[PDB]
Structures are given as C-alpha cells and as structure tokens.
Amino acid sequence: LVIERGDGIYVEDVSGKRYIEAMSGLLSVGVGFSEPRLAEAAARQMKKLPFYHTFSYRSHGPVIDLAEKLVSMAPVPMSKAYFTNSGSEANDTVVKLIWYRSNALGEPERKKIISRKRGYHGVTIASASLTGLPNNHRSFDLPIDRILHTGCPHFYREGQAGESEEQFATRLADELEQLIIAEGPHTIAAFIGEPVMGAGGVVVPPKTYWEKVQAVLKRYDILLIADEVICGFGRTGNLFGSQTFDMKPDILVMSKQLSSSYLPISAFLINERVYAPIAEESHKIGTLGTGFTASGHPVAAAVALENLAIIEERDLVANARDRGTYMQKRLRELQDHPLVGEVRGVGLIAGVELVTDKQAKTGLEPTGALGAKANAVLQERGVISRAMGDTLAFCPPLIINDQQVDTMVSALEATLNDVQASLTR
Template identity: 75%
Template sequence: MPPLPNSIEARDIAFHLHPYTNARRHEEIGPIVMAKGDGVYVEDVDGKRYIEAMAGLWSVAVGFSEKRLVEAASRQMAELPYYHAFTHKTHAPVVDLAEKLIQLAPVPMSKVHFTNSGSEANDLIVKLLRYRANGMGEPHRKKIISRLRGYHGVTLASASLTGLPNNHRSFDLPMEGILHTTCPHHWREAHEGESEEAFATRCADDLEAMIAAEGPETIAAFIAEPLMGAGGVVVPPATYWEKVQAVLRRHDILLVADEVICGFGRTGEMFGSTYYDMKPDIMTVSKALSSSYLPISAVLVNERVYGPIADESAKIGTFGHGFTTSGHPVAAAVALENLKIIEERDLVANARERGVRLQAGLRTLSDHPLVGEVRGVGLIAGVELVTDKKARIAVQPPGALAARAFGLIQERGVISRAIGDTLAFCPPLIIDDSQIDTIVETVRLGLDELAGEMGMGR
C-alpha cells in the first residue's frame, strides 16, 4: 500500500537518500518510522513495539531514553553548548573524557584525539600513520594491512580499510596502499579437517607472507577488530591473536585495534583487546562511547605513536588536522555520563552473564534445517543461514535467505540485522534474561515459518 500524501513516509521517499539501502527499492516500499525508544525497546509511529536486538547499530549500550544522558546533555548545552579544540583551546568535558579513556585503556596510552564517528576515526589513523612515517624519516612505511570482511568505516580511506565488496563497488576502492589478508572465519575458510589452531597458524603465515612480499619496511600497521562485527560476527579461532601479534612484533609493525563495536563491554570485558589479550598501539572507539546518543569517537595512541607525530608538528609548526566539532562539549559530557552508568551498573558484567544465556539460547537453533553456524561472544552473536548444511551454501542471490528471515523476525517484534546470510544480534548491555529468551524464541519461530515456506520443515 503506497504511503499517504504528505505523510512522513512519503516525504522520506521524496527527500531522503538512505545509507545502506537500495534507493529504488526504497521508493517502492518506503521506511518504517520509529517514534520512541525505552530501554531495549523501540516503537514505530503505528505503535508497534520491537526489541532492538541490534542496539540500533551495535551501539546503544545503556538503552534508549536514559534520563541521565538527557540531563547531561541539557546541563552542558546550557553552560557551554559548543567550543572547539583548535589552537590551544579546550574545555572541561573534553579533558575529563580524554583522561577517562586513558585510565580505561587496556594498555598504556598517551593521547586521545576526538572525531565524530568510527569512520572518521579510522580515516584519521591512515593520516596519522603517514604523518608519523614522514616524521620518522621513513616515507616508504605507509601501507596498511586489513582483513577480508573486516569493517572499518565508509570514508574514502576507512572504506578502503573495510574488506567488504559492497563498500568498494562503484566507489573505485580500495585506494592504493591498503592490503587485505585472510578472514579468520574457521567455519567458512578452514580446510577440511583443519583445527582452529592450525587455521590460526595459516592465517598468521598468510600475513607474514604478505609482509615479506610487500617488504616489512613498507608496512606501517595492521588494523583489525578484536571480533569482526559488520563482516558477519566472525569470532577469531583459538590462538589467532597470539600468533598474529608475534608476526607484527617480529617486523616492528603497529597494531591498530578497532574497538568501535567491541569496546565498552560488548564481549563481557571493557574492551575486546582485553578479551583477546591484544596489545594495540592505536585504538578506535565510538558507538557505545556515548551509546550513540550524540556523535563522538576517539583515537587513542601510545607514546610510540604520539612522539614522532608531536615532533613532526613542531617541525611543521602545526598538526594540520581537526574537525569543527572534534571533542564537542555536549557529546563529551554525554559520553562521560554514559561511561559512569556502564561502571556504576556493572553493565560489563551483565554483558558477560547475559551473554552466556544469549549464546546458549541461539545455539539451541544449531540443529534447525536453515542454520549453518551459530557464533559469538558476550552480547554479540551471529546465526548464519544455509539451505545445504554440508555444502554450507544458501539460496541465491547471496543474502536473500537472511533478508527473508530478518523480515519474518521483525514482523514478530525483534529487530536483528541481515549481513549476507548471517543474522546478527547485539542487544543493549542492559538486557535481561526474559528479553533474551524472547529474542531466541522469536528467531526460532521466524526460522520455522521460513522453513515451512521452503518446504524444509523440522
């Protein structure tokens, strides 16, 4: 049924170009208009209520409509609604937040630079690595290795770091100097009979071979999510990070941990780097930093990274980078209050404890005729769908199966995300057991209906 003239839906179709959307398809079906949010729930303009099992976009840690964040924004808006950090200016919220992030960091860090999104933060890292290389008198050391199916954003540089075809197609990406090594997805990429440990060794060997082929002296850094999110919730195999970090140390290559999704409790630890015993030189944080109530992100660097950059800024006379709203005082104030809530309510422990229930619940679907693999850690999980379990393939075109499942589950009141043929789940850290059980049962019912449609009933 077409939307009514002058409705929000009709005006959205008329005026709004949506991210991650088939524009022509959107003209046909229009949007779902969300009107309210409360805790783990959102409600559309028709009054239908959903469990937001993706926390928006992997990000609303403390839930929707948290009054303390609203009040923090209001207080700061009334006192200092905006100021910048250019040319030796600062303000209390940005200083307090920088100090807090250094205190929380899983390894010693030196400085924090603020941006407005994870994409911008990772884009800046590309610039920082070039700036640092020039400052060290190593202008050849500027290549960055990422991974196939890794996700690091959508700007020109960060989309190049991203290892997903749809972020490259028709954008003429990736740009020069960005390389992609093996995706560490054991179920999908391992050889027949290859153990997780053996597969991890092969991934590390692939990385080492790439470094050798390119020349170690040309590689600035390796960037990776501790656990891959938007590439389909890919959990690294046992011993992966131990072996990869040994390769990086051997060749004096920096490690960049993209904590945009994993950071601030998602894995059941404050950072994914802690969960996997990673020792990054640079970290990217965003999303749950402010529960995405306001746009803010940050790049944390250690002294090994900061020193040459500071020296180069002295040589040139400035560090020629910054955004008008870098470290915005209202966003910083909201982020500080958000981190206080995460600590005071022990939401990291809640993610760890409720995560056990989420992972166990979803794994009860493993014998479903449409389920190939269930994977995840803490409160992040993926259910990969197939129509042939042995061949590990789904109906064509790719993504069609999960898209249909996503729709059936959403109709029943749970919002997930279809990534290829994987259904992703990443609920707010405040979720309780009964809400987790509702998610699992709703997914089961949706998959049962889909199997029935396909003549694959249990």
C-alpha cells in the same frame, strides 16, 4: 519500517508496535533508548558552554575529563586521546597520522596498511578502502593506494578440507607474514583489525589467531590498530574486545558507543611510541595540521562522560557478560535446527548463519535470500535483527535481562520453524 520512539531495549513504529532492538540501532545504543541521565547531561552542558573548539591551545572541561577517563580506562598503557565525530573519521585520521609518524621517524616508505577481507572500518575514501566488503569498493574506485587486505579469519567459510581451527589460525598468520615479506616488511606501517568483525557478519577469529598474528607483527615492529568501534564498552564480555582477545594495540579506536550513540562523538587512543615522534614533528612544522571543527565537542563529551559513569555505576560490563553467557548458550541450542549452519559469538554479540544444505553450506538462490526471508518473519514476531547476507546478527543493549534474552531467542526459534515449514514448498 518507520521507527518513532524507543524505551529501554525496545523501539516502536508509528503504528504503536513494539520491537526488541536486537542490534541496539547500529550496534551502538549501549544503555538503551531511554536513558534520562544522558539528556540531563546534554541539556546541562548545552546551556553552560554549547560549543568551543580544541584548536590552537584551547580546551574545555568536558573534553579534558573525557581524555583523562579514556586513557585511564585503556586495556594497555596509553598516552593521549584524540577526538573526532565518527568512527569513520577516526580511522581516516589514524591512517593520516601513521603516515605522518613514519615521516617523523625517517621512514618515507613505511606507509602501507594491512586490513582484512570483511573488515569494516568506515566510509570515507580512506576508511572505506580499509573496509574489506565488496559493496564499499569497485564503483567508488577504491581501495586507494597503500591499503592491502589479507584473509578473513572465518573458519566456517575459509577453512580447508580437513583443516583444524588452530591450523587455520596458523595458516592465516603465515599468509600475513607472506604478504609482509612480499611487500617488503619495511614498507608495512600498521595492521588494523576489529577484535570481532561486526558488520562483516560477526566473525569471531579462531582461537590462537590473535596470539599468532601479534607474533608476526612484533617480529617486524608493525603497529597494531584495534578497531573497537563495535567491540568497545562491554560488548564482548569485557570492557574492550582487546582484553577479551588478549590484543596489545598501539592505537585503539572508539566510536559513538562512547555516548551510546546519543550524540556524535568518537576517539582514539595512542601510546607513547606513537605520540612522541608525532609531537616532535608538529613542533618542527609549527602545528599539527589536522582536526575537525567539532573535535572534542563539549556537549557530546559531557554525554559520553555520563554514559561511561552509568556503565560503571550499574555494572553493565558484568551484566552484558552474564546475559551474554546466557544468550550464547540459548543460541547454540538451535545448532540442530535444519536451517542453522553456524552459531558464532562472544559476550553479547552473536551471528546465526542460515543454510538449507548443511554439508554444502548453501542456502537459497541467491545468498542473502534466506536471511531476508527469516529477518522479515523475525521482525513480524517483534525482533529487529540485521541480516548480513544469510547471517542474522544479535547485539542487544547492555541493559538487557535474561527474561528479554529468552524472549528474543524464542522469537528466533519460532521464526526458523516458520521459515522451515514454508520452504516445503
């Protein structure tokens, strides 16, 4: 499929066929594909100061405004913002600064990072190691040393026979505590988690998961990294997924949804607990020895500022919340369809996991074929979704309206009826 242009929630292929972009590109195009104010902000800044760097006591207006804006928006008190080009780079720099911080606190052994199976955190050698998906690892010799993985909080696929949802949450927290104790709690620097796992199949954690996990982390004074790369800026029904799930991160990572993917930019926020010992170490060394050439890029920063202004001016967090409520309801009305194993989601993100045998939770051979078959029909019916194995993901732009949600979910129902009628046989 060759995509040539976009407009609102739609993209068009070279033949002129229009599709609802049900994943907003890479779960990132928040304001849709034709927001003219973002091009206006880019063109204005690029003709004033197209590039300057933030190295060595230099700065510029756009990054200063954006740093203030992001800190002011934080769901918990934050101290500083640091800028990169991608979410992958951000998580990579976060791991590096966590090691630096532990050295700056006289803890040379507190260097291990706990991630989760099916988590997604980027593609650098380090951030691909954090990533808990199989295709990211073995043939790349990953994960690197110091990165650990605990279990995926996906009740439908990980719960034991007869186990309740909250018992499953308790078991995950206990398995996390068991991991920390067996590794040596003083060796664990941080735990990283998406509020909801996006690329791993839209895994919504069981209720009480984040409360119980945070109790464990607080017991050992382990840092919490909230990876808001997908869940940020209105996706889950609040500005940040951390608010939706009552998470209190020390570090909060944001991706190019900062700019609705219109330009490469990413950032993370750190609280005073993280910043202060890093600042003192940088003073003993004489510099903080890291940074990307385009960190804080003024044109990307200008576009991000305008993108955030649009989200606030047009109340897009509330719009996503309310369209999300309607989408979640419409999708769950398909629960009784013969091919629907599970419907999961919160706010404006959802997954529909397909099966052909509901009791055994199995689909076609191999797993992935059913999702690939349904996704092809869905595309033909004018909706672009992402098949994550046998899960179809829905993550449309924040500007969508109820009429468009209705069209998207009706296309999915018709798709499932088509696939059902064709499987026999």
